[PDB]
Amino acid sequence: IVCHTTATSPISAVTCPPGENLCYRKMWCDAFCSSRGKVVELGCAATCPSKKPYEEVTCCSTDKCNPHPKQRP
Amino acid sequence: SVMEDTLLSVLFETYNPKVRPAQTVGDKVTVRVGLTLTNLLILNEKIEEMTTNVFLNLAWTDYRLQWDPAAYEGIKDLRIPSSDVWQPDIVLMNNNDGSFEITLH
Amino acid sequence: IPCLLFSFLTGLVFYLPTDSGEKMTLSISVLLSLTVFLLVIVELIPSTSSAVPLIGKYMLFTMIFVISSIIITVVVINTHHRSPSTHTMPQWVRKIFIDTIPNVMFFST
Amino acid sequence: NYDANEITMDLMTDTIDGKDYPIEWIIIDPEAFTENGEWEIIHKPAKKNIYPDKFPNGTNYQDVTFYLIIRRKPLFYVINFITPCVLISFLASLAFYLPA
Amino acid sequence: NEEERLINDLLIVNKYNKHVRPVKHNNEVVNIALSLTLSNLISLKETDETLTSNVWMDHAWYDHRLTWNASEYSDISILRLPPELVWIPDIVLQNNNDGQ
Ligand SMILES: *[C@@H]1O[C@H](CO)[C@@H](O[C@@H]2O[C@H](CO)[C@@H](O[C@@H]3O[C@H](CO[C@H]4O[C@H](CO[C@H]5O[C@H](CO)[C@@H](O)[C@H](O)[C@@H]5O[C@H]5O[C@H](CO)[C@@H](O)[C@H](O)[C@@H]5O)[C@@H](O)[C@H](O[C@H]5O[C@H](CO)[C@@H](O)[C@H](O)[C@@H]5O)[C@@H]4O)[C@@H](O)[C@H](O[C@H]4O[C@H](CO)[C@@H](O)[C@H](O)[C@@H]4O[C@H]4O[C@H](CO)[C@@H](O)[C@H](O)[C@@H]4O[C@H]4O[C@H](CO)[C@@H](O)[C@H](O)[C@@H]4O)[C@@H]3O)[C@H](O)[C@H]2NC(C)=O)[C@H](O)[C@H]1NC(C)=O
Ligand SMILES: *[C@@H]1O[C@H](CO)[C@@H](O)[C@H](O)[C@H]1NC(C)=O
Ligand SMILES: *[C@@H]1O[C@H](CO)[C@@H](O)[C@H](O)[C@H]1NC(C)=O
């Protein structure tokens, strides 16, 4: 699978290892949600990551579902 | 505002804030001293001290800071940093610390 | 360490016979010493409410231990001055504490 | 330093769904906030306050106030003040079972 | 560096005064939007009756004098400036205990 990840600077399209066949996208408002917007974590996960009252998780099994909201999959 | 800059440049050409305004040698400046209490914080009796948050309300007349508002787009009042005008050294004499002067300028 | 001493003394009052009017003296003075030690604990220990520390659990334990010792001490003292004129010994009292237990008490003498 | 006719203190606005909304609360990062060990935050409002008894010329007609309604965590006292005293007073009561 | 030319054309050339409100006429108001972020709540000493807080004030205002056509310069979309060069609204905590 190929996902977008914020584990690289800049954001890059990478090939997840074995077991991680899902592309995810966490987004939550931190102290700077007003100026900068929501945080954006991207990457690959084996099991879909857990969600919290403030987090907003998008979860796929397809290639490049998880672009930064200012980009297209 | 361009009229405010012009007016400030005019007023403060030869204005010295080290000098007490006496349009005529021998005059006295009239200072009105009021006090606004915002909170009586503490009256520690072990050290005989009294802590307050107050606004002083000072008023005086500086003959040098005059102008016709008709010449400056109707500017009838200016807000000017305190360090730029002459101000009297109105202080708390009966302090227990060594802080005579005010905190917020 | 002071808490250890106080807990040991708490357990210790139970070898003191009621004939000496000092069981309550001892237990209650252990309790007073532990209250003064709570007083110093409040000065040497964090005053936070996020969790009970280990010392706090131990302190509460020794305090409940002392207090239970005092309560059972009172019960013992009353069982001592339990006159026949007003109370009659039942069957279980002279069956357990007089015919069974004294026979399985080897450290007693 | 300025009167209400010279500057206007307002609350910051934000957007979610193409609509502007004011930030009527203190902002607190939900991950990077380490809760204090004695106080819990229940409410955290923010208000722009106008005092119409006063005049706009003047620095007392304006106020942006941020309120913290915080609740105490009652554990240090419950473990070190209330429980011991309660049980010791119970001892006093039980003193009536002690023969003279 | 394009910033060196710009920060000159704004502050020195155009004779920017930091002791003057950013208004064309002295009858308009400068709207200052301020929020508050609580980084951490340190204390609420009940004896001294004082809340201690680490907060981030977030001001926002328009200064028409700090304007520029980004294409006239290079495409400079943003600028950082020390507040000792630009006009700042001294928005203060009035209900403070210390002299801070
Ligand atoms: C006490 O409290 C503390 C705070 O409360 C707490 O701190 C936390 O500790 C944990 C564990 O120590 C931290 O978790 C780690 O965080 C790291 C940092 O993540 C940042 O950076 C990476 C990029 O990393 C590259 O670049 C950085 C910086 O330049 C280097 O330092 C790295 O070595 C690495 O460099 C390589 O790659 C570069 C190119 O990118 C090359 O140039 C270079 O030459 C090297 O090859 C980003 O990806 C991160 O972004 C992600 O996270 C942020 C938020 O953190 C998100 O915002 C963002 O969107 C991304 O999601 C971040 O920016 C991580 O690197 C580290 O990751 C490893 O571990 C996790 C799980 O633990 C794995 O998922 C991950 O794959 C990594 O595993 C690799 O690395 C580990 C060792 O790090 C190996 O064990 C493992 O086998 C695997 O190995 C491979 O890669 C290694 C390179 O990393 C390589 O060396 C190996 O040889 C092997 O090939 C992990 O997530 C956490 O950040 C701390 N938090 C804070 C706030 O500090 C502490 O734990 C507490 N302690 C106790 C006892 O309680
Ligand atoms: C402020 O406005 C009030 C009400 O119009 C007026 O009485 C007062 O004189 C004004 N103060 C100044 C300094 O102009
Ligand atoms: C900015 O400068 C470019 C270059 O001359 C010009 O084409 C453009 O119209 C300018 N924009 C504005 C808003 O003046």
| CATH number of the domain where residue A42 is located | 2.10.60.10
Contact assessment for residue A4 and residue A42, using Cβ atoms and an 8 Å cutoff: yes
Q: How many Cα atoms within 13 Å fall on the side-chain side of residue E2?
A: 12
Task: Give the residue numbers in E contacting A (CB under 8 Å), as ranges.
Answer: 35, 37, 39, 56, 58
My answer on whether omega of the bond before A49 falls inside 30° of 0, hence cis, is no
Contact residues, chain E, for A31 at CB < 8 Å = 37, 39, 56
Residue D81 is classified by DSSP as: I
Ligand 2 near D57 CB (within 6 A): yes
Please answer yes or no on whether D30 and A28 come within 8 Å at the CB atom.
yes
DSSP string of B57-96?
A: EEE---TTS---GGGTTT-------GGGS-------SS-S
Contact residues, chain C, for D90 at CB < 8 Å = 67
The experimental resolution of this structure, in angstroms, equals 2.7
What is the distance in angstroms between the Cα of E47 and the nearest Cα belonging to chain A? Answer: 31
> How buried is residue E97: exposed, middle or buried, by Cβ count under 10 Å (0-12/13-18/19+)?
middle
Q: Which helix (H) or strand (E) holds E36?
A: strand E30-45
Please give the C-alpha separations between residue B2 and each of A34, B96, E66, in angstroms, as whole numbers. 34, 46, 15
Q: How many Cα atoms within 13 Å fall on the side-chain side of residue C53?
A: 15
Biggest CA pair distance of chain D = 83
Please answer yes or no on whether C50 and D99 come within 8 Å at the CB atom.
no
**Which ligand minimizes its atom distance to the CA of D3?**
2
Which amino acid, A10?
P
Give nearest CA residue, ligand 2 atom 3. D55
Q: How many Cα atoms within 13 Å fall on the side-chain side of residue D90?
A: 11
Listed as own residue / partner, the contacts of A8-12 with beta carbons closer than 8 Å and 24 or more positions apart are A11/A42, A11/A68
**Does residue D2 sit at the B interface (CB-CB below 8 Å)?**
yes
C36, C37, C41, C47 alpha-carbon torsion, rounded to 10°: -40
The technique is cryo-EM
Contact residues, chain D, for B78 at CB < 8 Å = none
Residue C5 and residue C12: Cα distance in Å, rounded?
A: 10
Residue count (chain A)? 73
Neighbours of B16 (CB within 10 A): 8
Residue B94 and residue B100: Cα distance in Å, rounded?
A: 8
Residue D48 and residue D44: Cα distance in Å, rounded?
A: 14
Range of the domain at A70: 1-73
Residue E1 and residue A33: Cα distance in Å, rounded?
A: 31
Ligand 3 near E71 CB (within 6 A): yes
Please answer yes or no on whether A34 and E56 come within 8 Å at the CB atom.
no
Question: Residue A43: left (phi > 0), alpha (psi -120 to 50), or beta?
Answer: left
Ligand 1 near A12 CB (within 6 A): no
Please answer yes or no on whether D7 and E32 come within 8 Å at the CB atom.
yes
Contact residues, chain D, for A30 at CB < 8 Å = 29-32
Contact assessment for residue B55 and residue B38, using Cβ atoms and an 8 Å cutoff: yes
Instruction: Give the total number of structural domains in chain A.
Output: 1
Neighbours of B17 (CB within 10 A): 15
Bridge partners of residue B99, in order along the sequence: none
At residue E57, the 3 state secondary structure works out as: strand
Identify the residue among E58, E59, E78 best suited for mutation to test binding to A, counting A beta carbons within 10 A and taking the highest: E58
E43, E44, E47, E48 alpha-carbon torsion, rounded to 10°: 80
Residue D10 and residue D21: Cα distance in Å, rounded?
A: 12
**What residues have CB less than 8 Å from B70, skipping those under 6 apart?**
none
Residue D25 is classified by DSSP as: B
